Write a protein that binds this DNA or RNA. Structure first.
Lengths: 85, 87
DNA sequence: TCACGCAT
DNA sequence: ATGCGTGA
């Protein structure tokens, strides 16, 4: 079934977008592909430990990690902006 | 067995996709409507202008999660630029 | 680990 | 759309 291939492809395509969006996944992809790790890349981590394996589960796990981190960051920042920290 | 370890492989992925549905606000509100749950004022605000998801399949959970990541990333710059008095 | 065909 | 089987 070609249709069934579209369902797998569309899920995989969104998996790759998370890899190219989450900093802990962008850094890992650079190592195995022999790409330059810059201080910009190290700055995007914001202290988060870079991912070692690049499977689907790790991509999802890191995406969950990045979402909660960004949330806490926004919260603390807004607490400073509204003079609440 | 190979079927058993493959079952734990498939279950492990689905456990994390369900976890995203329990974290992204556009999916939490969508889950409340499909399960006939009271959508409060705080639920609507968490969306921060993002539209709730219509379908709740795996692909929908992923695409709304990517949307939520970009929203929080944009809201950190703005919030930060102001904190540093740059704006 | 992932893709795939199938029964659901 | 998706869990399962299975070959890879």
């Amino acid at each position: 079934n070609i249709i069934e291939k579209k369902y797998r492809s569309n899920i995989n395509d969104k998996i790759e977008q998370l890899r190219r969006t989450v900093p802990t996944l962008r850094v890992a992809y650079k190592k195995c592909n022999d790409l330059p790790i810059t201080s910009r890349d190290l700055a995007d981590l914001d202290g988060l430990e870079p991912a070692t394996k690049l499977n689907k589960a790790s991509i999802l796990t890191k995406s969950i990690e990045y979402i909660c981190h960004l949330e806490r960051k926004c919260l603390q920042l807004s607490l400073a902006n509204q003079h609440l920290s």
